[PDB]
Design a protein around this ligand. Structure first.
Ligand SMILES: Nc1nc2c(ncn2[C@@H]2O[C@H](COP(=O)(O)OP(=O)(O)NP(=O)(O)O)[C@@H](O)[C@H]2O)c(=O)[nH]1
Ligand SMILES: *[C@@H](CC(=O)NNc1cnccn1)n1cnc(-c2cc(C(F)(F)F)cc(C(F)(F)F)c2)n1
Ligand SMILES: [Mg+2]
Lengths: 208, 1011, 123
């Protein structure tokens, strides 16, 4: 039960950061432009069973676009991303949507305005209307604060499985093993732990 | 493995190997997929891969391989078409056309290879953009003719025509020059009469749903631009509003078509077109009532069930009704025979407004605002909609979203974490409509609310949700009623909410009802101002909630306190009847007790609210005495902490001491924020010792960095010490930004400040420099910079070169210094430009470098200020007239600014700054073509006018930067650009035309004559 | 769900990090409720932590007695410690974890409960 999901939008809007947050839980602060596409499997556990997304995270920068719309072939859903702090990225949403629906004529699509954690918002909520005539779902999101970060996948799962009452459920938690530490390298995790002890945790000014 | 073989072009292309790489990419996974991906990209990017295209389309068995082949042709067609020899152009055309014809006539391929045919159609349209109609003025006639030979061909021709209309009318603004867009628009316009014939015939004929849907899809695009007569002088509206609404296959696209028809503004004087506008609406609503759903249907439930395409249809229905009615409902409001149609259409909207779907609700709510705002003003209209508006009152009251102020939520009633701004705008919109609805019938609104309340008292409808949405609605309509009705209204609401407080004893219960009462009371300050006895009781109750163990209620009580004070402060400074003292006196006297259980941030809000009150006292002597009373506790803790810090200056090692100091300063910041210029007496009480503390803390930080390394800056100890410095800077910045006595600022505050902060900033290691120093200095320069010319020079000397060196190695490090740095340069350049004139020539060159460095940022904060500094600097220099410094400036830097501005204009990586870049470039060019540079810009024959040399310089610059342009393109572009340097709109269009042409070969130089 | 045979000895909101020794940086693993679960049958206490909205497991391991909570240089409200067998991502991997809390009082209470649990597992 797997579905191909293509993720498109201007460079720097947070597509790869959003996926990585869902993949590993991390928040990547650095901007390393995606080269063409990166494919990652992503599984959610639902009350209707597991759903697997094959996430095709495409490049937004034209100079790194690779196969461009070739990535959209046989997609079953999509996320269009823009950055509420960059008006140009919302102005390009109709261009990404055009190229996407020319290949994928009848798929569920979520429009996501990312980076709502930033105080100086530029794309006002009242002006976000492109989704209405195009039957896209819309969410404000923040990959940094996790605001609404699950809602695009929850909505897509509901449309793809065909069950509006689908919800995410807690994955079962097997009993963890009882392993004693290794005395052959016990004198070594002094080093790997000292390094970790003296490397400051990021974002110490956050509520958590 | 050997997948890379296809990257070698010495041999012939192994099609079977290619197909394996493609299948590996699309159907594979893991590393093989990743490697195949890179190979395919490299293959596609080979400038000769297009020559392999046709043999891939001939001999490949993989549809994805052929798709990628067409992507290779598209790149060639869109960017290099006119560089091909003419024979290669006809070969590509003939091959693409034949492939399309071949795929249509094979009924099995036409069914299953839809994407590949769509991609080929788009590829053909790319050829049309280059070749049609000048080099193919029979394409449309042949397309029309060939539509009769086959149904599959006719259907596919509708797809080609749809894509052509899109590329010409919908997406041409960014992709073509003005001249080419006009050419293709006129060309389609001239041949549309025939296109419409084929379209209307197919629709009237009526083959099967496949060809109809494709024809309607193309019609949707035409409606964006075609003349009105094609829609009203034919029978097409009857077909759309009846025939094609009945079949669900065509209903979705037809509704979108009728929505586009609806949004035009009709010739508002011809009765016939009005009757036709009424008629297709009447037909459409009748088809919905009989074929889809009656007006009584439960659309909320239907949407929730989400069968088939129901959700999309209801979205499209909402868009159709709101679009049409916002434009044309007046056509239905006078004729009594149309009253039922008008009200039935609005009843469908009522039902649509009950759907649980935020974005759909916002769409209908937008329409309702349009309606009620019109009924608020238009004579004799609101009575028509009385029943509609009554239902709408119920819908909105029962679907109010949680306002910002309500900090308690259920997940178990707990405390908010995040600011829901998707919900902020929604609440504002709901409030706006409900306010209008209350004005339209205040009796109906009160009766709904009072009755719903009466059934909360009974527990007959009690729930979290029902009391919350009702309370939020009640608070949101504040200001709609007259003071007298409001009086009686609020009394009734409070009395009954209090009754509900005692009834529901749960701790979750009591928290829900407390938040609702706090919200309501905070929303009716007019009532509070008139009933002091109640206001006093409310405030004392809030003080008791400041000892609540429920953190949500506690936080909300502090916010409600300041929210009430902001509006009612005057009633806290005066002595009320029956009162022994102004209430501000009572608050201050027990402030330690009141705030004992609050977190520090909340204590600061409490002090800020007191400062609001104190600033209402205009008797200076009494105000200052209130201020000193308010600051008693922090000033005593301050006096203790500084006497104990001067003697043995090591007690600041104590983390507990650092926390105490930071909170003292944060308290001063809070009171200064609300008191502004009135805060000066308190600032003078601590200023000297505070700057001495600033120096003492700074020595500690430096000592820790030296003893522990840079990592010390991450430690809780050093972070707490820097918080002290940051808050001191914030306090000074806050006061100076609101100061009214600038003489005292300059004579008392500035010199000790600069002595304390500047050298410390300059002589710290980069990772220990506080960007807040820059922010503080920006405010100093902004407010008194004109009075401290030598102080501004001192700021530059201390922060300019060392901060520049922090930020000029990449675009990412020290992001806060980056932003503050250019805000500081901006204000210095606009208010104390003389400070840059005194700079040494080497430093002034760094200044120019720093400005152009800002250009290349993608960070909008930095980029915008950089372009503004450059523009203000050019103006600053121009204002000097014909003097050596200005002449030397132009000689050294004019062409640097021109070339650097051109670079960011054309590199496709700074699109967001186009407008400001264009403005800067137009200013620079206008300087030369107004002879406002009084010195030759060159080092070329003598006597040459600067206008001639600028053209030569730019022609040579562009020839070398864009060598694929012809000399005539560059000359035509510059000719148009220089002539238009007094008309920003036309100037910008010419720049946009250039940015199009540099992306292809063979652009027409006459395009620059468009204006 | 596989947790109803267990008793919640302690629960606290936390943010969990894992140390990427290669990149020499801490990486967030998840934010949510950190629970100390005692198995009613075996009396063994484990840490189980789930992400807020997806409810995905980001920590699942015994609170072994050989572990020691250490401070991080940049925080007074976090603990670092080495874990040898965590099955949140499936196969029992070894991790260097850091866990941060909303307040120093939370972090200190956590250490108290973490050590009490170690005594229980010491049986
Ligand atoms: N403040 C904030 N920054 C975010 C957020 N999401 C992503 N970013 C930041 O935006 C920048 C871009 O990162 P990235 O995820 O690679 O964007 P992208 O669209 O995938 N880039 P490309 O399309 O060129 O491959 C990063 O610095 C990232 O930290 C967010 O929600 N909030
Ligand atoms: C009802 C109950 C109450 O007074 N305090 N709560 C509890 C909780 N647990 C046990 C016992 N009592 N209640 C709730 N809120 C109010 C109330 C609030 C306010 C406010 F505006 F400040 F929020 C004002 C007033 C008023 F009207 F001024 F008295 C009452 N009462
Ligand atoms: Mg990316």
């Amino acid at each position: 039960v797997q579905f191909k999901l293509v993720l498109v939008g201007d460079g720097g809007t947070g597509k790869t950061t959003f996926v990585k947050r869902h993949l590993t839980g991390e928040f990547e602060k650095k901007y390393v432009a995606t080269l063409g596409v990166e494919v990652h499997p992503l599984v959610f556990h639902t009350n209707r069973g597991p759903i697997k997304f094959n996430v095709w995270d495409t490049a937004g920068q034209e100079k790194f676009g690779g196969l461009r719309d070739g990535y959209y072939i046989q997609a079953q859903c999509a996320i269009i991303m823009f950055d509420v702090t960059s008006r140009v990225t919302y102005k390009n949403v109709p261009n990404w949507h055009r190229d996407l629906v020319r290949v994928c004529e009848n798929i569920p699509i979520v429009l996501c305005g990312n980076k709502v954690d930033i105080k100086d918002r530029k794309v006002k909520a009242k002006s976000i209307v492109f989704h209405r005539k195009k039957n896209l779902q819309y969410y404000d999101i923040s990959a940094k604060s996790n605001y609404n970060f699950e809602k695009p996948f929850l909505w897509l799962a509901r449309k793809l499985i065909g069950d509006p009452n689908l919800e995410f459920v807690a994955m079962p938690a097997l009993a963890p093993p009882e392993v004693v530490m290794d005395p052959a390298l016990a004198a070594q995790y002094e080093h790997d732990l000292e390094v970790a002890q003296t490397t400051a945790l990021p974002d110490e000014d956050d509520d958590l | 493995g050997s997948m890379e073989g296809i990257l070698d072009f010495s041999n012939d292309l192994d099609i079977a190997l290619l197909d394996q790489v493609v299948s590996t990419f699309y159907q594979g996974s893991g590393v093989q997929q990743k490697q195949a991906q890179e190979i395919l990209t490299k293959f596609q990017d080979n400038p000769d891969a297009w020559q392999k295209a046709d043999q891939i389309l001939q001999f490949s068995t993989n549809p994805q391989s052929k798709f990628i082949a067409l992507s290779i042709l598209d790149k060639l067609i869109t960017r290099k078409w006119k560089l091909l020899p003419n024979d290669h152009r006809i070969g590509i055309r003939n091959f693409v056309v034949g492939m399309i014809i071949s795929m249509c006539q094979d009924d099995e391929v036409f069914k299953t290879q839809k994407n590949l045919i769509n991609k080929s159609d788009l590829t053909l349209v790319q050829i049309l953009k280059q070749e049609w109609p000048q080099n193919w003025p029979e394409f449309i006639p042949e397309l029309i003719g060939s539509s009769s030979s086959s149904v599959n061909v006719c259907e596919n021709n509708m797809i080609v025509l749809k894509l052509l209309s899109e590329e010409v009318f919908d997406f041409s603004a960014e992709q073509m020059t003005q001249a080419k867009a006009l050419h293709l628009k006129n060309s389609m316009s001239k041949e549309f009469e025939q296109i419409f014939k084929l379209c209307f015939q197919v629709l009237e004929q009526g083959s099967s749903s496949s060809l109809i849907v494709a024809t309607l899809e193309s019609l949707l695009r035409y409606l964006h631009w075609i003349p009105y007569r094609y829609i009203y002088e034919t029978n097409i509206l009857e077909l759309l509003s009846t025939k094609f609404m009945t079949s669900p296959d065509t209903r979705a696209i037809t509704l979108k078509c009728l929505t586009e028809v609806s949004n035009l503004k009709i010739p508002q004087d011809n009765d016939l077109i009005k009757r036709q506008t009424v008629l297709f609406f009447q037909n459409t609503l009748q088809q919905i009532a009989t074929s889809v759903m009656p007006v009584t249907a439960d659309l909320k439930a239907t949407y929730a069930n989400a069968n088939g395409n129901d959700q999309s249809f209801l979205q499209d229905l909402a868009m159709f009704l709101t679009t049409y009615l916002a434009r044309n409902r007046a056509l239905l409001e006078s004729d009594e025979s149309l009253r039922e149609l008008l009200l039935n259409a609005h009843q469908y909207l009522i039902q649509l407004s009950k759907i649980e779907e935020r974005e759909l609700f916002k769409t209908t709510l937008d329409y309702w605002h349009n309606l009620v705002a019109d009924l608020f003003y238009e004579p004799l209209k609101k009575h028509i909609y009385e029943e509609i508006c009554s239902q709408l009152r119920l819908v909105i009251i029962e679907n109010m979203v949680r306002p910002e102020e309500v900090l308690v939520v259920e997940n178990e009633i707990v405390r908010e974490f995040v600011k829901e701004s998707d919900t902020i705008q929604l609440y504002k919109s709901e409030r706006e409509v409900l306010v209008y609805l209350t004005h339209l019938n205040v009796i109906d609104t009160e009766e709904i609310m009072i009755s719903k309340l009466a059934r909360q008292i009974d527990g007959s409808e009690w729930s979290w949700h029902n009391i919350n949405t009702l309370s939020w609605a009640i608070g949101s309509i504040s200001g709609t009623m007259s003071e007298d009705t409001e009086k009686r209204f609020v009394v009734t609401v409070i009395k009954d909410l209090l009754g509900l407080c005692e009834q529901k004893r749960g701790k979750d219960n009591k928290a829900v009802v407390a938040s609702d009462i706090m919200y309501v009371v905070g929303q009716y300050p007019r009532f509070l101002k008139a009933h002091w006895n109640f206001l006093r009781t409310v405030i004392l109750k809030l003080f008791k909630f400041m000892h609540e163990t429920h953190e949500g209620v506690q936080d909300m009580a502090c916010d409600t306190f300041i929210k009430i004070v902001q509006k009612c402060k005057y009633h806290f400074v005066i002595q009320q009847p029956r009162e022994s003292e102004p209430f501000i006196q009572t608050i201050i006297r027990d402030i330690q007790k009141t705030t004992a259980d609050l977190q520090p941030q909340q204590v600061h809000t409490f002090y800020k609210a007191c400062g609001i009150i104190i600033s209402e006292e205009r008797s200076v002597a009494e105000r200052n005495r209130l201020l000193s009373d308010l600051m008693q506790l922090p000033n005593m803790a301050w006096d203790t902490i500084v006497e104990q810090s001067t003697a043995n200056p090591t007690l600041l090692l104590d983390s507990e001491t650092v926390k105490i100091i930071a909170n003292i300063i944060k308290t001063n910041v809070a009171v200064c924020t609300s008191m502004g210029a009135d805060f000066y007496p308190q600032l003078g009480h601590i200023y000297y010792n505070m700057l001495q503390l600033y120096r003492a803390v700074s020595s500690m930080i430096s000592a820790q960095v030296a003893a522990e390394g840079l990592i010390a800056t991450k430690t809780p100890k050093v972070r707490g010490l820097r918080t002290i410095k940051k808050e001191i800077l914030k306090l000074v910045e806050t006061y100076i930004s609101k100061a009214r006595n600038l003489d005292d600022v300059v004579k008392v505050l500035v010199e000790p400040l600069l002595n304390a902060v500047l050298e410390d900033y300059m002589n710290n290691v980069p990772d220990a420099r506080d960007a807040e120093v820059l922010n503080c200095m920006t405010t100093v320069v902004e407010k008194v910079g004109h009075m401290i010319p030598q102080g501004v020079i001192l700021i530059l000397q201390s922060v300019f070169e060392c901060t520049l060196d922090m930020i000029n190695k990449d675009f990412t490090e020290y992001p806060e210094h980056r932003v503050e740095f250019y805000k500081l340069l901006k204000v210095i350049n606009e208010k104390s430009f003389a400070a840059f004139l005194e700079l040494p020539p080497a430093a002034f060159k760094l200044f120019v470098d720093a400005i152009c460095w800002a250009f290349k940022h993608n960070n909008r904060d930095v980029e915008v200020n950089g372009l503004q500094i450059a523009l203000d600097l050019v103006k600053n220099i121009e204002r000097m007239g014909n003097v050596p410094f200005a002449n030397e400036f132009h000689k050294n830097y004019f062409f640097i600014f021109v070339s650097e501005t051109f670079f960011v204009l054309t590199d496709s990586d700074h699109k967001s700054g186009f407008s400001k870049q264009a403005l800067l470039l137009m200013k620079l060019i206008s300087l030369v073509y107004d002879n406002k540079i009084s010195v030759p810009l060159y080092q070329v024959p003598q006597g040459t006018s600067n206008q001639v040399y600028l053209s030569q310089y730019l022609a040579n610059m562009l020839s070398n930067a864009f060598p694929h342009l012809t000399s005539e393109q560059i000359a035509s572009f510059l000719s148009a650009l220089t002539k238009q340097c007094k008309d920003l709109v036309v100037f910008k269009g010419t720049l946009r035309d250039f940015l199009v042409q540099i992306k292809e070969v063979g652009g027409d130089p006459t395009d620059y004559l468009f204006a | 769900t596989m947790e109803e045979d267990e008793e919640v000895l302690y629960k606290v909101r936390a943010k969990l990090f894992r140390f990427d020794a290669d990149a020499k940086e801490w990486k967030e693993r998840g934010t949510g409720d950190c629970k100390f679960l005692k198995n009613k049958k075996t009396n063994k206490v484990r840490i189980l932590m789930r992400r807020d909205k997806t409810l995905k497991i980001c920590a699942n391991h015994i609170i072994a007695p050989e572990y020691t909570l250490k401070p991080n240089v940049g925080s007074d409200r976090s603990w670092v410690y080495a874990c040898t067998a965590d099955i949140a991502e499936g196969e029992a991997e070894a991790f260097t974890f850091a866990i941060r809390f909303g307040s120093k009082e939370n972090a200190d209470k956590f250490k108290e409960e973490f050590e009490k649990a170690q005594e229980i597992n010491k049986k």
